[PDB]
Structures are given as structure tokens and as C-alpha cells.
Amino acid sequence: SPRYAQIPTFMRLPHDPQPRGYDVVVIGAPYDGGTSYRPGARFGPQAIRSESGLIHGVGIDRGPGTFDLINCVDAGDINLTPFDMNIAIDTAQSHLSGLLKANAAFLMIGGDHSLTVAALRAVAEQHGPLAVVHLDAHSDTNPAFYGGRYHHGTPFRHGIDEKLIDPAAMVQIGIRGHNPKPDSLDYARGHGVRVVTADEFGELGVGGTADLIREKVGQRPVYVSVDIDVVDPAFAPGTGTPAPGGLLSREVLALLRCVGDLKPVGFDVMEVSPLYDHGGITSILATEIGAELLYQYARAH
Amino acid sequence: SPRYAQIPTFMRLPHDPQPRGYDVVVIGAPYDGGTSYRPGARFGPQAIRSESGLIHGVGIDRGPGTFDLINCVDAGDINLTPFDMNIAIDTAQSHLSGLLKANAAFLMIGGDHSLTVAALRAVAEQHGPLAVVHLDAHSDTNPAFYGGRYHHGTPFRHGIDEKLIDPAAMVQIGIRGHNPKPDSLDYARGHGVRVVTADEFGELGVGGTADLIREKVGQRPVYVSVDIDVVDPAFAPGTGTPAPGGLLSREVLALLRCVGDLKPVGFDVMEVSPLYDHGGITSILATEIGAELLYQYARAH
Amino acid sequence: SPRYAQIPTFMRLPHDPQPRGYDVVVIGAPYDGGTSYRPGARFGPQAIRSESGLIHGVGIDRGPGTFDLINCVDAGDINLTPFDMNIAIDTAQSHLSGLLKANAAFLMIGGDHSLTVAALRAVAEQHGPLAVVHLDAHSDTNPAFYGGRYHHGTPFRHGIDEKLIDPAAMVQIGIRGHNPKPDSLDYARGHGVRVVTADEFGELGVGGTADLIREKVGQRPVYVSVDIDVVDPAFAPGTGTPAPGGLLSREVLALLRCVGDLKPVGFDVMEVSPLYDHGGITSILATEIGAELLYQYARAH
Amino acid sequence: SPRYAQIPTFMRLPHDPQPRGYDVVVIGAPYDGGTSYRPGARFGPQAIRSESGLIHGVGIDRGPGTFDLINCVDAGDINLTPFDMNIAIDTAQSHLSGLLKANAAFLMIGGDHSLTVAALRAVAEQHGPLAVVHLDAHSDTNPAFYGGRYHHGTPFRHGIDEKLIDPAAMVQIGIRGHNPKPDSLDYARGHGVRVVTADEFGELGVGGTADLIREKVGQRPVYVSVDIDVVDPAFAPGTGTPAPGGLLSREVLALLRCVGDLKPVGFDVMEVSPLYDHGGITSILATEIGAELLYQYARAH
Amino acid sequence: SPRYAQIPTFMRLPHDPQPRGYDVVVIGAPYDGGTSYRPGARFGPQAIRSESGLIHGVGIDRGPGTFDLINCVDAGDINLTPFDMNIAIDTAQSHLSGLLKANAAFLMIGGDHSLTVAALRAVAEQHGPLAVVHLDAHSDTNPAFYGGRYHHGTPFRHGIDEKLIDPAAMVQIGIRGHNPKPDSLDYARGHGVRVVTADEFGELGVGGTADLIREKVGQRPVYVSVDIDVVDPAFAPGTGTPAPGGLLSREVLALLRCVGDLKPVGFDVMEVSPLYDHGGITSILATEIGAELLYQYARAH
Amino acid sequence: SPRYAQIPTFMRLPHDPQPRGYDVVVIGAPYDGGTSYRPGARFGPQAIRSESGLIHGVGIDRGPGTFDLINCVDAGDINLTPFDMNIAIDTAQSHLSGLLKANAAFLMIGGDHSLTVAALRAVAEQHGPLAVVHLDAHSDTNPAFYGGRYHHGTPFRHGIDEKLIDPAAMVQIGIRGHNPKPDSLDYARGHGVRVVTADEFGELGVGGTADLIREKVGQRPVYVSVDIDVVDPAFAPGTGTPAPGGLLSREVLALLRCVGDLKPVGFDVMEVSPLYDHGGITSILATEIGAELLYQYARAH
Ligand SMILES: [Mn+2]
Ligand SMILES: [Mn+2]
Ligand SMILES: [Mn+2]
Ligand SMILES: [Mn+2]
Ligand SMILES: [Mn+2]
Ligand SMILES: [Mn+2]
Ligand SMILES: [Mn+2]
Ligand SMILES: [Mn+2]
Ligand SMILES: [Mn+2]
Ligand SMILES: [Mn+2]
Ligand SMILES: [Mn+2]
Ligand SMILES: [Mn+2]
């Protein structure tokens, strides 16, 4: 049976709009109301599902395969309105919380990074202050404002302010490019957030960074949020705010292997904007990233 | 609830892999093993479903809307192998026949036009020799050959040879471009098939051609097969064998309105090849064509 | 001096962010917060300006050329936020009103059609109830709702409700496809709006429709709003909600010639979404449409 | 044998870099040194050859097929430098003249329209003042200037000035858009050139225009020059200077049928710029146009 | 003479459909009947030839240039049917064997990787059991099946089973992603095939892997088969089954330098699918890879 | 205020066609008359400006931000004719010299690399023989010829011949691929130019190469010329002559940091050809490169 046949689900997992009893639920968040530049992330879930036919759960020289170790399912998407930022975030929180009431954790395949604040609220409600591993070209700890409380640059600002995240246990890797202001990282650092710029990542290497993550996160429940623009635009051209000089696909995938040494309670892959993608390579990468996280979840439990 | 949200089905119809009791079942045939030039029609069903979110059943100044008049469903796709032409055609016939055992008719959204021979066999088995309305830039009545019994240029040749079609009640509109040989249409015409070239269509007009169809088809059970390349490449660039100087989108959609004055027992929309499409306009058109046929089915019954 | 050289302005007109004393000001509205399906119209103004280098004011066998008859300028764009629908509409109204305080009229090159409610408010404030010529594939007279008061399907609903438009003097041409509900046009018609579907347009022809417009509009001050999706997706693939079976580019351009026989007090060209465009043909067409309106403005005065 | 197999030649004709004894030689002119806006026409010959696999010489209900009536061949390309306008034009003239020394006529598949002056010089040298049928969205009778003697807007200006063309026997169809100056057509008309704008073409129709051509050309040796941008950008997006509101593909192809009633001594299809093409539909159309001209040549002799 | 001028051949080499006496013949295999996901590799030969204009034989600081050291030619393509897998493979074998009867070796630029079994049969027939250097993201040693004996995942399975390859002298580099089953590599390894995953390649480095190849291949006649998907999708997006986290272009090109220390008797570059390519960079890379192999052939002899 | 709003200028800097008193003026050179293969670089300035909205002057953990340290402005473009190579180069020289008469230095965002000879003449006229840091995949020190005195392969040949450059103080990094002749680098090396091939760059590393630059350039006034094709086609597909196996985006950006330790008197970023770009990633990279140079200029002064 061809992998491009049949209605597309993430990695061809079974479909269940009202999942109950699974370890990890894959949930789509087709929304880009938080994008400040290029929109289009609302089609991310659809594109990612479409290309995921090429990725299975069986790695290489790994065990029996992710899906034989844990029970996963594709719960469809959250009905997020494209007309009201505040309403969409609340709907997201509500939906994500609902999932956690009957399932261990979820993997959000979405639109812009702003939606992560909803995930953090839902996950923190069930585990308490969370440790965070954030892969992004941008810090996403910028101030909100009137008529723009949830732009995709505020997710982790809210997380820290709302005590959803324990800054002393948060590490963001890949920061590069330009800050909106010269003292934009003072906030995150002042709160104890460990910032690893793309430059330092190059000095530390994958192993070095992996050790740093393990040391800063420990065994606290951790949320892994991945902004697709963390990798260089060459590997992920389909995104809203590309930033030249990013990580290689293999570097990111290799790094994520350390997640298996932690206690992940949730993750997401955001900012995929299909329209700007070339040959669907961004969606395919996004899929591979999701697959690696799902497998690491299994290894960790 | 946004139309781009949730797993995509044709026109967002309910999904049921084993449909029973419906008037018309939408079935995908993701296969391009019959394409002689550009492949890719295997992704047609997926692309068409994806863009169909923009098309509803409620026309304009029409009745209550197609889906309140008849019961339709998206039965997913036929598992067609991309490795063996003969096996795929048989699988298609078997699957399509299965659908007719518990449902009135089907609408095949597929890959290349070769698959239509399987539909004709399935439909003819339940209604006897069929009347045919074929929209295509090519006659598709060419000879088969060893190692290529079912290339997309043979569907209606088999239909006539196998007595699945009553040539005296077959009309193909839109023929233009180039025949493989100077006497290529002698076969169809010798059998009594009415050929209306794109040129003559221009002289007859939509109404004139509609009258011709009604007169040649009468009230016999009719199968309506539409090759997307019937319209000019400008309106449908996403197809395997484009042919300049074709019909306008509106001309084809207007023409299909006459189907409501007949007794349709099945139809298909083939040759959509997404990779060559621009802005998804081909898939969107293909969707609109399917919607018009579904509505005409309702009007006819 | 090459037309692709120098910072791009609409039709290479002079730039003046705070214009005063001109006949017609070209103003960009880079916003798509009202789009219900495909976003991207926020880049419309930029793309349209970019490709406008190919279009001059000198027609063919026309007079001395549009720009020697009237004084026009490119006023840049309105700073429209992508984070709040209500705030963007108010900012648009305010900015457009500002322009009318020192200039005769404006030509809004924008994002989604929802922004037209802001233009109608600004224009109506200076001329009173307006006559309207609306070219669109959709009526855009649908009900608003909580958390979505200004989706691009509500502009003319608000116009009528707010008494900004005199329905008895409004004509919309090109309607086709699907209404959200079977009784969706009852509203517009009940108010006396003349609806000319793409089908009727075909029967009436350009001349017939032009006479109808002149008769229904008279000499009342008229606002001409053009949704790029009025033309078939083949001619304008770069738009948010394509609708197959639309008008030909030449048909729309020819029709707009009748504007010179009226008293235009404003116009706009909306819904151009560059990302879905092919070869920039949509932006080029949008430019030509704007040029024709500017010229007709001159002819009318 | 698949049509996409083997090194590509125009319509899969035999290849012969030094042809002798043929009726019509297909020659490529990969050059865009004359383009004033979008470059890229230098790849036109290559793209056109590539897609020509879909077009044969056997029409529909026509005779035995073009290639059984006349002997044609693909002579490869003229080595045209992209660094010097004047040198390229001379090289073109020299090469084209060489072809005519041993073959009846040629079909130039090229780059920008400026190259036609070289063809006119070569053909006029063997037949004397020529009658001309020019299909273009622009008159191409603009003044040359220092450092730009051969921009693609000067071909027919030179033709008339150099007495290569008999203006009283020249007809250009499709003119639309914008003239560089309000009295830009005075030159052509003053010389007796019959200008049929896209607008008038609509009034005259294909038949009416065909009669006009026959009447104005008579039996004088005629050169048929076709600028691909004569058709609307929707049908030919792959060109340097698109002009909205153009002819339909079928209109142009139908019109060219009248060439068979004349005495054609040469023709060309110019301005195809592949990079801006969508789905290769422009190259495919260009191919079909060349095929129709080749067939009409045969019919005329 | 511009490199984009004249009918395109691989690296602008002379053309000869029936070559005799050359060292290396470049032969195209326009076929994708073995692709299991995205088709399109049938256009690989054409696209690769088209872009090869940018690559010459003269390296940098290398000797006199590849083409002055050995005699190469472009033999056109093998007429491979797109309708029957088994017939195409036999035709390929027959054609490739024919070439070896009068020429030293060949470089197959093709479609999907399944075609390599035909090359292995032809080469093994003249040299006996072969040593193999296989660059691919997938092992291609999967089981065949009824109605799919030659899908692109079976080439090296057949090679070993048919004794065309000496597994103890086979090395495949770049394996990554997902195996169809958790014990999928047991077969290759059980036969003594050295598998170097993309991960291990990173540890070994180019030099380390080069030493490993030299040691495992020795001086036995070796066939070098390169699947374009061995490099990360960012460098080669135009392929049927992309696999994130692949090698860098420079890594692969640098690695291939070790071929000059072996005794190459044949090579191929497969899976290039132009439709999914961006800016032709995949075809350009494929060309550069072919050039490096040709040069290494010369160095080795 | 959205960054995609308002007429686009490089990095949203103020616009001033006749700048006076600034430290660095950003000037566009929309010209590709020197391209030998793919044209299109004439749209480079426009595309780069368009995407530059994403890049600010405020780096990360850097000082107050580039634009608070120095005064920069976007001077628009040089009116370069696309019809005459020699005239365009002279116009460029004249315009660039004019800028230097009232501003410290300029950053040329242009078309093909041939234009750099004009910049070198203008800069050398005010500083004397210049030291040069050239990043390119090609040496660009090839011989000129009649009818092609300024093809993009001659810039640095002229620079040395005309004594505008002090070869003993010139370093070009990234050379790879193919030389037109086996002894093509003898010229540059014979003059004392330090050539660092992409291969050697890999051995030296960023730091090693940075030291080499500092040592070979010293404190002499230096011109930094960057050909976008220096990075692998994966990172910069939008260019005229791609060369596989190039540098990573981060490698080039990191390397340019050493410019701050020198005395830069001018720089340029050339060969960006938008049409071949994917997701605008080439233009975005080009922007980032320009930003880094501007910042390093500030650091150096
Ligand atoms: Mn983010
Ligand atoms: Mn980010
Ligand atoms: Mn067909
Ligand atoms: Mn067809
Ligand atoms: Mn609208
Ligand atoms: Mn609309
Ligand atoms: Mn022309
Ligand atoms: Mn023209
Ligand atoms: Mn393979
Ligand atoms: Mn592979
Ligand atoms: Mn260069
Ligand atoms: Mn270069």
C-alpha cells in the first residue's frame, strides 16, 4: 500500500479526533495569527502531514520502532480562528488541556510560535513549573503590547512571567541574527535562562550542547519547543522569518537525541510556512524532527 | 470552523473507507502508471482534496445545495500499485465494483485516464452497454500494445472493443492538437462515435453542443469522463499532456449543466498532475467540475 | 532609465508619504487579517508596485496620457497591524480620511477586501451615501460575528447597514461559485442591490453590463471596488479565494472603461496574494486595472 | 520510444548543424541582449525544444502530416554573444543568410524580438521588399538610440527604414497596453502599416482579421513574425514584457491558419522567457505556433 | 560560443548514438517506473544535460582537464518504456551491454535507482563479480515482490543474489532515516557488506571513509553507484525520496576523489527528479558528481 | 509598524537619491549585461531590498546597533542601461565617484560582478592602489575580448592591470569548480594574489583564513567584494553561475567579522539573480552579508 495513498495523517498514524488512553497525541494547530512578517503557517499542519508519508517510526539500528514502544495517534486539528488572536490562544489552551486529561502528552505540529504559550499553560497545569529546551533562531521573549498580546515573539516571555517555566531550567539554542533592541536578551538572562547562540553552538558542538542541556534541565519535566527556523534557510526555506547562518539539519536532529535522557512531557514543531517551501523539504524535515522527538519520548519512558 | 482545518476530504464530505447506502461515493485513484509523458497524476487525489476546501455544495440561486439532496461520502483511495499497470487496473475494477454493490454510483478523482477502463467495466457490469460523454483534448481511442496494454491513450478503445460502451451513444468534446497518426480518428468514427473537436465546439457553442449531447445520449445510462486537459493549459497547467488552444473553464462548467438532463451512472475527473500546477488552480477547477457533476446527478434524480 | 531601476512606486509615480493637493493618491494597505482561507494579501501592495514598472499612463490612441491630465502620487502604505482586525480597520479609516482632507480621491492597492469598509466610511463622510460598482466573484455581503467582525466577506454588508452605500445604486458583477448558504443573496437583493452573476454577464456582454451600470449608478458619486478574484484564476492565480469560471482579463478591463461616464470618488483593487501568483501576472493585471481606473477618473473630470 | 527520451530537437526533427536542401530549417537564436525589462529569452530555444516533445506534425483531420509534405530539420542555434548587441545582430544576419543559400526558408525560435531585423535582412536579400504579418502586444516600431541601436522595440522600425518591408503590405495584430509616447503609432501608420489593436481584433473576429490579412498581403512574399506576448499573460506568462487583456491561445492559432493562403518565405516565434513560465505552458504554446506555421507553409506550397 | 547555446549534451560532449572506441560513454536512462513515492526521475537525464553547460572538464590546479586525458561522448538515451518495469530493465541491460562491447565503460545518468541492476549485469558480464561503492541515504537491498520485482529499493539485493557483486567488497555510505523494518540491514551485513551510516560518516570524516573504501575495495574492478539523495535535501531537493540530515555537497565530492585510487569499471548518478528541484541546483550537483567520476576514471588509468 | 509596509529600501534605511555627508551609502546597480550564463542579476537590488525588511542593524550581544554608530542611507539605483556594456560601466564609475565626493564610502548591492571594476576605479581614485578581499567561487581574473571587454569574469583582471589593486595585498577565498583553462590562475598568482580555494578554506578554517586575510591586507585601505555564489548553491540558489560544494552561510558571515580589524573603504555583494532564488533565501542572505559589512565598517572606525 503506497504511502501517498489514503487520507494523510502524521506519519500515517491512525486518526482519532477524540483520543483517549494514548501516550502521545499529535495535534495540529493551523494558525498564523501571530506571524509578524510572512503568514502561511496556518497550512503547516496540512503540508507536514502530506509529506510525512516518507517517514516511518522504524529508525536505523534502533529498537523495534517508535510505534511499537508507545501508542500515538493523529487527533486532527484545533479549530483555531484566523480572525482573533486572543480567542485562538484560549481555544488552543482549552483543546490542549482537554487532550492531557486523557492522554500522557502531545506533539503540536502547528502554525506560528505564539501558540506555544497555550501549550505551556496546558502542560504546566498538569506538571507544575516546567524545564524548557527551546530551539529557535530568535529568543521569543519579547514584550507583548496592546492589540498584539500574542505575536509569535512573546511565547516564552509569557511562560516565564506566568511561572509556567522555571527560567533556571530553560535553555534556548540557535539564537542569531538581530535582536529588536540591543538589550533584548537581558530579560531572559536576568531570569536565569541559558542562551546558546548559533555561534556558541558551533564552539560547543552537538555533544557539548547536549551535555549543557542535560545539566541545566536535569530530571525536571521538560517541554521541547522547536521553531523550524532554527536550521539555516537552506534546510528550511518554508518559514515566516528566515535567518541566514543557521544550523544544519543533521546538527539539530543529532542534538534532539539527548531528549531521551530527560523527562519530556510535551513538544512542538512550529513556524513551518508551506508556501515558501521548496520541494517540500521543510515539511519533510519538520516531520523527521517530530519523529525523533516521539522516539526520544519512548526511550525516556 | 476554517475550511483548511481538519484532515482534508473531497469538499469536506464525511469519510468512510467502506461506504454503504450512499447515492454517490467519491473515490480516489492515486495512480499514474499509464502516463506516457509527465507523471505525477498519482498525487492528483491528494491535491484535489486539499484545495476542495473552497468549494461547497451550495451553488448560487440553485436549490438547497447538493449535499441536502443526495448522500455523498469520501471513501478514501484505491490502493493502486505504482509498479504494475495490469495489476493496478484489476485492483481498480475490483474496488470500484465493490462500491457499486452497496452504493448507487461513484465519482472517481484520479490519476491518469487509463483507469477509466476499470470504471467502465464496473459500471457496465451493473447497467449494460453505456452511453458516454467524454471531455478531453485527446480521443484516447489509440491501440494498446505489448508491455503497454493500458497506457492512458487506450481507455475508450477498450470500452468499445469490450462492448462496455455503445459507440453510437458516445460523444467526445474538445479534441485538438495532434493525432499520433493521420487516420487516428477513423476508428472511433467508424464505430459511430461523435467527435466534436475544440474547433467545432467553438462553432456549435455551449448550447449547441449541449443539444448534441442530449440527442446522441438520450436517456440511456451515461458515464461522464472528464480529462482535465480538455481546458486550455492556462486554466489547467497541472496535467500530463497539455494541449494549447483549449476550452475556457467557464465553457466546460457551463456545458456540464446538461448532465442534469440525462441519466448519469458514474463519472470521473482525471489527469490532474499537481507538480505542474500553478497556485493550485488546476485542483480547484477539478474540484468545481466534480461539484457540478454531483449536483447534476441530484438534479437528474 | 530602466523601469526596474530605482525604489518601486506604483507605476513609478513620485513618492510622498504626506501628499497634499493631488487629484488621486495611490495608497497601499498591506494587510490580510480579514482573509478566511489563504493569507498573503499583506504583500499585495509590494508585489503590485514591483511589477507596475511595465505599465505607464500613456494608453494607445488615447489622449496625452493619464499623468498629464491629473496629478497622482504614491503615498506609501497605511501602517496596518497584522495582530488586530478591529484596530487595523480603524487605522485604515483614519489614514484614508486624512488623505481626503487634502486630496480629491485615492486608489487603494491593498490586502483583503475587508479593508474596503474603511474606505467607504472615509469616502461617504465626504460625499454622503455612495453608489457602488463592485467587481467580485463573491457578494461580500455576509454577516459578521463575534471575534470576526471584519472578515473579508463583510465589507459591503457594513456599507449598506451603515448607510455608507445606497443599495439602489449598487451593482456587483461577476458573482459565481458557491454562497455560504442557499439564501445568501437575499440580503443584497432585498436592499435593492443589482447582482450580475458571471453567467448573466456572459449573456449581457461588456456593452450590456456597461449600460446597466450607467443606468443604475447615474451621476451619483460612485466608489469602484475591484476584487482581483473577479477574473478567472487563470488570469489571477495570486489571490486568497480563487473561483473557477471567471471573467477574462480583457472583459474586466473593457468593462471598466464605462467608469469614465460616471463620477468616481474613489476606488480599490484588492485580494492580490503574491505567493500564489505565477510569473507575477496577477500583480501586472492588478496594475493595469488601477491604471485604467486612474485614466477613467481623468476622463470623467 | 518515449518523446521525452533522446537529446531534444524542435518537435523531435532530425538534427543537422549545416543543413542543405530542406524546405524549412528550424534555427534557434538564444539571445536576450535586446530585452528592456525581463531578460531570459536566451533560454527560449532550449525550453521550447524541451517541451516540443508533445507536439507532432500530424494535425487532426488534416492531411498526411506536415513532415511528410515538406522536409524540415533542426539546425541547432546561432552562436549569439550575450555581450554585444551589434555583434549579435550581425552574426544572426550572417547565419540566417547562410541558411537561405541552401534551404528554402527558416523558422527562427528565439530570444527577444530585436533579432527579427536580422531575419528580415536575410529574407529581403533573397525576395526583395517583404509583406509582413506581425503578431505582438507592442508595435516594435520605436526609435533606436546610441548605445541601444537594437533594443527589442526597434525590429520593424529598421525593417521599414531599410526598405526590407513594404509598409503598405504590413499588418500587425494584437497591439494593446501602453505606447511609450501618445503619438508612437503615427510612424507606422504614416508609412501605411495596418494596425489592428487587440480591441479591434475583438470586433473583427478571427475571420474578419484573416480577410484583412489576405487583402493587405496579397500574394507578395510574406514574413510572419510572432511575439509570444501577443496572447494574454495567462496563456504565455513566460515572456519579458507581459501585457494584460491579450488574445486567447485558440484565437492566435486559428488566425495563423490564413498563412496557408499566402506565400510565406520565413517566420519566427520570439520573446519566450522560460524562467517566468508556469508549467512550461508558454513553451508548449510557442511550439504549437511553430507547428501551425510549418504546416501552413506546406499548405501554401 | 555561449554554453547555453546548441542542443544540450552532457557537459557539451560530442553526440554519438552508436559510440565505438571511447573510454567512457555517458548514457541517459529516462525512466522512473521503479519509484515508490515521487515519480519524475524520467526527466533527470534531460535536466542534468541542460544544466551541465556550466561544468567543464578542466578542474582547478588539476592536470590538462578530463577530456584531454580520456575520450568521452554522449550516447543519448536508452529507449526505456514507462509502461513495463520488467521490459525496461531488460532493454537497459541489453543497451548497456551493447555499449561495453565497443567502449571501455559508461556513466549512466538516469532515472530511479532500480536501473542499476541492469548496469551491474552488463558490467559483471565483462569483469566478473564486482566491488561496489554505493552512496545513498537508503540501503536499496530490500526484497522484491510480485508485480514489483524491480522497485528502486532492490538494485543491490539482486546484485548480491545474482553474484554480480562481491558483498565482501561492497561499501555503502550515507545510510540514514528509516528502514522499512527494524532488521532491514541484517541482509546486507550478513553478506559482508560494510554499511557506513551518515552518522558514522560524521565520525570517520571524509579521509577516514576514503581509507575504509580503499581497504574494502582494494584493486578489484569497482562500480560506483551514486543516489543523489545521499546529500541532504537542501543540496538536492530534486529527488524522489528525500531524507533529512544528509551529507554536504562538498563532503560527497571530496569523498569521490578516492575513486582515482581504485579501478572503476562503471558508474551512475541516479534519482534526480527535476520537478522537485529548486534553481536546478540538484541537476548541477549531479553534473559535478559525474564530472568528478569521469576525472577520477582518468586518474585511475 | 510592519517591516513589509512602506516602499522598500535596504534594511529600511532612509532614502536619498543625492546623499551628502553619510559614512556609508547603499547603492543599487540593477544590471546583468556582464552575465555569461544566466541573466537576471538586474533584479538583484530590488529583491534584496524587498527581503531586507527582516534584517535590522542591531546584532546580538553587539553594541548599540550599526545605525546608531554610523550614518547610512539608501541612494536608490544607478541608471544602468541593459543595452551597452561599455556605457553601463562608465555610468557606474561616474555615479560611484560622485557618491564618494560627498560620502565616506558605499555598499554596492548589484547585478553581475563585472560592475566591480567601476567601483574599484572610483575607490582607487580616492585612496590609491587598494588591498582586496574577494569572496567568490571563481577567480574573475579572466582575459577580456572584443565585443566583451567587461564580462563578469574580468573585474579583478582590470583591477590589477589598471593598478587599481595591489595584488600583493589581495586575497580571494572560495575558488572551486572549473577554470576555463588549466593555467587560468597563473595570472593572479604570478601577480602575487593569494588564492584560497574552497578546499584550502576547509583546512584553514574560519579563524585560519581570518588570520591570513589580516596578514595579507594589513592596514592598507581595503575593498571587500562578495560574489553571492561563494556559498554553496543550497544557501544561494539565486545566482547566475552556481558552483556545487561551496561554503556554508555561517562560514562566510563568520569570516566577514575580520573586516572590523581592517580599514574598509568600500564593498559590494553581487550576482544575486532573484528568478532562480527559492523562498528568497538568497536575497535574505545577501542582506545579512551587507549588514555584517556595514557593522564591521563601524567597528573598524
Ligand atoms: Mn519562534
Ligand atoms: Mn524563530
Ligand atoms: Mn485522456
Ligand atoms: Mn487528454
Ligand atoms: Mn471580495
Ligand atoms: Mn472575492
Ligand atoms: Mn515584440
Ligand atoms: Mn511584444
Ligand atoms: Mn537508491
Ligand atoms: Mn535513496
Ligand atoms: Mn564573480
Ligand atoms: Mn562567481
UniProtKB/Swiss-Prot annotation, chains A, B, C, D, E, F:
Its pathway?
Antibiotic biosynthesis; clavulanate biosynthesis; clavulanate from D-glyceraldehyde 3-phosphate and L-arginine: step 4/8
**Residue ranges of the TM segments:** none
Q: What is its EC number?
A: 3.5.3.22
Catalytic reaction equation(s): amidinoproclavaminate + H2O = proclavaminate + urea
Q: What binding details are noted for the cofactor?
A: Binds 2 manganese ions per subunit.
Q: What class of enzyme is it?
A: hydrolase
Q: Where does Mn(2+) 2 bind?
A: 136, 138, 227, 229
An example of a Pfam family matching this protein is Arginase
Outline the subunit composition. Answer: Homohexamer.
Q: What is the name attached to this protein's record?
A: Proclavaminate amidinohydrolase
